Hints:
- The structure is a homotetramer.
- The first copy, chain A, has a domain of about 260 residues: Type I PLP-dependent aspartate aminotransferase-like (Major domain) (Aspartate Aminotransferase, domain 2, 3-Layer(aba) Sandwich), CATH 3.40.640.
- Chain A contains 16 helices and 14 strands.
- With about 475 residues, the first copy, chain A, is of the alpha/beta class.
- Bound molecules: ligand 9TD (4 copies) and potassium ion (4 copies).
Amino acid sequence: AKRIVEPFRIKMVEKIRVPSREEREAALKEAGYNPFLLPSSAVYIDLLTDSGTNAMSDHQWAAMITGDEAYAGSRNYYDLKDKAKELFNYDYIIPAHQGRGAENILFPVLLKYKQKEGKAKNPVFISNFHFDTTAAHVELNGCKAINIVTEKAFDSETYDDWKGDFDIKKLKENIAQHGADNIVAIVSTVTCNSAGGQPVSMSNLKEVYEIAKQHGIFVVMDSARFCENAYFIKARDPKYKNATIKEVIFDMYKYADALTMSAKKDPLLNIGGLVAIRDNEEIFTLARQRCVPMEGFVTYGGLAGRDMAAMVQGLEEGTEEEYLHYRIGQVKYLGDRLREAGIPIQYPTGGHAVFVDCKKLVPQIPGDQFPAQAVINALYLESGVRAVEIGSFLLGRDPATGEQKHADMEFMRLTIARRVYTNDHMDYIADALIGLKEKFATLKGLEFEYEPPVLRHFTARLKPIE
Amino acid sequence: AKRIVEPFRIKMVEKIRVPSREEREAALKEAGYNPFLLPSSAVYIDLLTDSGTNAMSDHQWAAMITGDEAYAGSRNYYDLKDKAKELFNYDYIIPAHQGRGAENILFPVLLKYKQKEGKAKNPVFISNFHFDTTAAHVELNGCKAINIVTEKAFDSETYDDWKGDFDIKKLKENIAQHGADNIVAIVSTVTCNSAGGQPVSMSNLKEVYEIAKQHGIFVVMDSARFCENAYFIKARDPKYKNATIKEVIFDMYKYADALTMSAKKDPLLNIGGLVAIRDNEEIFTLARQRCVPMEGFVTYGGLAGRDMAAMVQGLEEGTEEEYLHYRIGQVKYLGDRLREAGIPIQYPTGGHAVFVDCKKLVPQIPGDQFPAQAVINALYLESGVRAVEIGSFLLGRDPATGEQKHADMEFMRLTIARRVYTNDHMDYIADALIGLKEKFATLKGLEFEYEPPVLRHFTARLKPIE
Amino acid sequence: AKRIVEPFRIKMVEKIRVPSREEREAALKEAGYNPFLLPSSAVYIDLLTDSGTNAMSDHQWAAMITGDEAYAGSRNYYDLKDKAKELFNYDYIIPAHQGRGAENILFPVLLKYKQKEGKAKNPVFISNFHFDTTAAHVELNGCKAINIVTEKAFDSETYDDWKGDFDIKKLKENIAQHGADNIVAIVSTVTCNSAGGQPVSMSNLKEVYEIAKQHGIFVVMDSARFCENAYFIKARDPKYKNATIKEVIFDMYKYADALTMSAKKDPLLNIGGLVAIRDNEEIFTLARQRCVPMEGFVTYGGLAGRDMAAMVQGLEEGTEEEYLHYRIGQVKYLGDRLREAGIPIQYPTGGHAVFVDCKKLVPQIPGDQFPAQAVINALYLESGVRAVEIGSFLLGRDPATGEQKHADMEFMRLTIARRVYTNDHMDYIADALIGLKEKFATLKGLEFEYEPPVLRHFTARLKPIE
Amino acid sequence: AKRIVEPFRIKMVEKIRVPSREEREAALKEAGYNPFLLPSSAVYIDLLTDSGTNAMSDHQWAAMITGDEAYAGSRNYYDLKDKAKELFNYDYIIPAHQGRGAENILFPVLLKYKQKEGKAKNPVFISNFHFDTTAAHVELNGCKAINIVTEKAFDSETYDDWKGDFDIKKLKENIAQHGADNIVAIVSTVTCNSAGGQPVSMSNLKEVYEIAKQHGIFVVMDSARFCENAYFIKARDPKYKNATIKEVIFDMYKYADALTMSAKKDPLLNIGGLVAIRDNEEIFTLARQRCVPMEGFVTYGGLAGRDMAAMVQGLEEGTEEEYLHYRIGQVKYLGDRLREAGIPIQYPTGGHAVFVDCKKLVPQIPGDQFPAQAVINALYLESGVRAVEIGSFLLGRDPATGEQKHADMEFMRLTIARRVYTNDHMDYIADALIGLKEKFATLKGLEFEYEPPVLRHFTARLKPIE
Ligand SMILES: Cc1ncc(COP(=O)(O)O)c(/C=[NH+]/[C-](C[C@H]2C(=O)Nc3ccccc32)C(=O)O)c1O
Ligand SMILES: Cc1ncc(COP(=O)(O)O)c(/C=[NH+]/[C-](C[C@H]2C(=O)Nc3ccccc32)C(=O)O)c1O
Ligand SMILES: Cc1ncc(COP(=O)(O)O)c(/C=[NH+]/[C-](C[C@H]2C(=O)Nc3ccccc32)C(=O)O)c1O
Ligand SMILES: Cc1ncc(COP(=O)(O)O)c(/C=[NH+]/[C-](C[C@H]2C(=O)Nc3ccccc32)C(=O)O)c1O
Ligand SMILES: [K+]
Ligand SMILES: [K+]
Ligand SMILES: [K+]
Ligand SMILES: [K+]
């Protein structure tokens, strides 16, 4: 395990505390054995998500203070429009309040646009893997969310460079089974969050786009963690060895027609989303007509002017190679510390988190009882670190059958906010989990006490299968 | 015309600038003759809205700096929860990124809740007046938006205390005509924005609620400008002459079951919304289930932690009677300056804006050609002041007939942001509009160059009728 | 009286309140009848000074957030050095924590420098007027403070363009009496604070410098309010009718060898000072050696890096003619309001304050009993407005005599912070003082209960003569 | 070497860069081979000082935003007064712009007070060790600075609990040698900066105060690092094993009559100083009379209101034992890493810096040629880390004899700012210095090119002896 020094120094700090063990037990019972329902005051190191918890730079804060809060035609909107043209070479932008707001702008528009001429009677979205919020909007509009990640992602301990790649074989098969007229869009997720933050190769993005161009299929790039994806392409593809991160980003988006990005990830923000469209003005026009009643006027889209300002700066900082090397190198440090101690993880580590394979860790719990959730609750009661589940819990139920969706991966996600915690914080996390090697065989799963029909894991209250 | 001194002093300033005449004409021609499509760099004094353009206090910025950005269980969420219990005596809250996000959470829930028990076969919403964003969500969910403001709101020059009241006769008539089973909810808009920011009396709110309870009808208080309504109740109702503003607010929300608040208005914010529910835990649970995929997790709802922190402080500052007296007095001062010169305005002035009766100002333009928009474009080219139309342009087309909704009033709204402009800015505005007396009879209407199907006035490009 | 609109809008506010008459009476008795010993909570509108109470822009606060706090070689130091070369064409800078710190760096160096040749046996300083802090450091170093302001400054009600000019005849008479070898330096105060913030003409500055170089006398420009002086030169000197404010400034500092500036005035700061030297590198090195033990290291001078960054921005905002026209126009508006009611004031009003001639307002109080202080205490008890006296109280005792220095003027100074109060605040100030027109003849003077030896008026406790 | 995790997380960052080798060699030759003359742009990790470079909390920045910038009676002044009464039990305070301003306020007042009855003909100050600016002010007022640190401070490698203790035998001998009437004050520096940031025991502080009150000698506590001293007392004195830090601080100041403090150290600020007096009102009044000419009015003393607000919060956070444990543990970690590699340091490590004994590192260079400075220049040219010399260079020449004062230690100080750098940054510093283990015999020494008469090390340019 190698530590990479921060390419920055601390300018402002925020106090954290370790709750007593009795506090954590009472807090978990009141939270229905769901860490999502814990208050932040009962959490020490918060690994629930890397979304909106990032630490901003002084230039980001300075940009916020001078932000133009005008309702129509904010100066920061035009700075954002020129920034997207610089990075992605896309000509149209629509700001959104965060990622699921961006999808709520674009996805229904893409469905109605595909439904012209009376086609797409059984519409489907195809992705390497739809994340929970992305798949929810696909199904909330009456479509099927098809995930076709490469099989090499399911072998957790075997190394591969591109565990987030599309399964090109499955892609052509789904196109032949449903027909191009029923395929609303192909959603390229970079990095593939459900597969473990694993990257997608350039040649995979190119081949997927060329196949979609053959059938006249619209391609959207789910761009929450595109900078971390670009870093891996520079690191693992010999073709981009002497290329800048921006040069890699510029080539990635030659293989998409639009993007839906959650600026709360790689752009190093606490709030914010973005829709950008390459050249289809009709799709841009329809998406604007939906942005107004749902998010807000088309030049702020549910964001304060200061947040568009912070986004303009954060989009530049998120692509800085020295930062990406430390950020991804820190996650690699936490994974290597666990891997060297015998904890099975998704190898190699992704861009934003370490994914502990809880299939091998707690095999006595079936997947339908959420074994990864039992490990998370044990980690919290042991250390006050709060993690999140990426397995059968998050996958939810199939909207057609109403039963458990087939989960190939049962993961505990140790999500790392950007520029927030040090490698000494990582050692605390690793040493707390390593200290539970003799208690893994004792854990038992959870059963539902209150289950929401859509995105159940966020607010569900669980009961320990005691 | 009387000037009221600021109960505060200036701590931070932002430069404004007057664009040249040639700049304004070219910018308007570029904007399709729609000021919404103007950039802020081409606007001197921006009177387009009082939403999100407010100036915050030092305490509000201090609250933002220490805001908890935790994804789940933010410390500021619980502060926002205790604040709603303090102000409104409501037990449940759901933050939203702004007002239309709050209505997107609650309104479809209130429809599915009524439908589940075999009611709402032909669903309608009843309000003193639905605003353009509020009515859009009603029509998007397949309902009819019915506006029953008192007739006195149409007698613009004649003073009346409560030009925002429900027409109680029309309320009982619409209940019998449609059936209480088909009325999804009653929406009490305080203040009534479409009627000129005019207040609703306490006795009117009470009688409307009691009527709804006889028929089992849900009552939602559209609460964007609730503090300005509470001031008018204190200033004009003899029953609350010696009551605090908070006491008036506490009594106001005894006559609703839930509220949908755009915190970008009276809570003195640049972004933010809120859903608060009095005691219906079932409606609260369904609303949370919809909030998760549409806005965000239930403890931030598409808002950064700092913005919930500013909301808790702004909710307090917005209730201070000394501030409200200055704010509404500044609107009254601008209206008086125009009224002293013969400009027909909605008298008395509302809480947040001066509404110029362009029906009486430019009679030679029929309402179907947006006469108020002609006055706005003339005022902008003369002085660089951007105003917004509240008439046939904003009312749009009726969804059932596809034809122009009958507009009872053609208003130009001079919307005043809170704690931003001085009374010397007000003098510039008044002098500018007064200087267009000899050119009113020469103005002409506008045609559509591009008309959106939903919320057209935001992005429609216009053509001056030759 | 004419109101001038702000060339900006408000972005942040700070609450002020009016304490009751009861609170003010118990506060003044507690404060030894000296308003300087009053807490700010017992003060409504604070007119004590225009120093450090200004409101900054958003660009200023942004510069602070990205400020380089480095101990040696802060990035903002070199920006501050490049700014002085732009504005003043001076080659050397030394930051100081405020203006009196800048005088403590430079003035002792000039005395020792003059004493090398065996000169300065009876050292004196010559100025149009040393302010209380400038003269104090002169007398701390064993020198006499000689003030030779134009006689027209004592002609209160009679208009004159340049009531801050040097008396050229008295300048030549003092050079011949004491000898050029005994004159350590000439201090050009712009504007002349003790004459009422009145400006010095460019030709007067040019003549004083030509006389000084004729005798080898060092010229220091007291530059606390240099921008307000530059505005008056453009307004009243026809040679600079079509010149920018920066061009006027550039010509002003052709007639000086160095400057001591309190950045808490025209550079729109809450803290900060500056020493700048034209080209004499020996003085720069000698002043650097004293800066280190007294203020701090030579690249921050007892200032935080954020404050140097705000200084670089405020120096630019202080030269904008639109702002100066509004700022000085606001002082002119308050002065005109008092003058239109018969209140004798130093006419025309200066750049930063309105000076009420209390020698004409309250004739029944001898100069040794501080008549203006009686008017201030009366004005504070009436309205809660705090003001400051510029007469025999501030002038102090003659160090060689030990008795009262003769004062030719008895001023009450209504000092206006920059971009803090509106013209409506100005109306409150005037109306309060005008309401005292019947109680002026009944006021009595003040005598000393505790007198400091150095600068008595700041911490002295008084006793009203009954 | 044990790494101690941060009791906080990062909220804001600022970027740091590693310059190239040629840039560092170009910058060092341009800086006159004096790191004090390097621009911060040419510095990677800055170990020059721990003064004013600290990172603030979110609470501290929030306090700045609501700071009262009133000239007289700022609310933050009264908060600072109550804070000093809480922490130190002292009844009087005077804010200063920084530590050397606090000494310029109090030290000349103590000299004239001691000379009140014509005594103190040969005045002296006695301390465990006067730091450079403190001794400079002692000697600027015609006094001798007597340092009597325990001789166990001169044995670098041998551990001792209290290497900052007064040599009690030399204290009593100095009292008899000079007479109590010549001893203006005794200065207890906590921690003792010149001895390596080493602590002073509670028993030592108690005995020095008892001996002083026996002779009627005023005792001033140089309190720049009083929290770090209070931590060591709790850590090493078994008497305070179960006491809080505040209880240790409260007991420390029973053994002084006043304090001078640079708030730029333990109170975690970027600017600020403080004078506090236990109960001597006459000295307080005399100190106020000097603050006004030199620093500013007595309720701000050369500080912006926001900086007094930051000081009230910083004085609280500086006493938090969890933070002090991590802070001092981080310095111990850097020292242990160097000590484990055979590099001599002042053992044990002090509170704020690792002191590398260059007398044992480069015995080839005599102390008169500043051997530690050659090591500093070598470390910077190798890694971009800037350190400071504390040896014969810092000590200076005798203001009497004009030759260099005897230095019993030649240190290279690796000063660590508070909450700014991670333990990974320490590894960079350690590995960089360890990598020079071979070039120590190559080092060269320095000779002056320009020497200031007071505090030479700051601005002196020097020629390499090679
Ligand atoms: C690829 C991709 N696309 C769109 C989005 C949505 O964006 P947004 O609305 O701004 O959150 C995301 C978001 N991911 C999240 C944030 C959040 C979520 O949505 N599910 C989930 C599950 C557990 C914890 C936290 C979350 C994350 O990984 O923690 C995303 O990963
Ligand atoms: C009573 C009420 N309820 C809900 C809302 C919606 O809240 P939100 O999503 O935060 O905007 C509003 C909002 N009003 C607006 C803001 C905005 C809008 O919606 N239409 C419109 C038309 C012209 C200019 C600006 C606007 C305003 O008056 O300028 C409201 O007035
Ligand atoms: C021309 C000039 N030169 C230097 C300086 C000093 O600068 P600094 O150390 O930053 O205060 C000043 C300062 N003037 C002051 C500020 C302050 C002061 O000093 N005396 C005084 C008397 C009454 C009220 C307030 C004050 C002011 O006008 O209110 C100045 O006017
Ligand atoms: C015990 C004690 N008392 C008073 C003070 C002075 O306070 P202030 O005016 O705020 O700096 C200090 C200050 N120490 C410093 C700061 C500065 C200095 O003064 N000399 C020096 C030498 C080398 C580098 C940097 C410095 C420090 O060690 O880095 C102090 O250590
Ligand atoms: K957040
Ligand atoms: K806004
Ligand atoms: K101030
Ligand atoms: K600093």
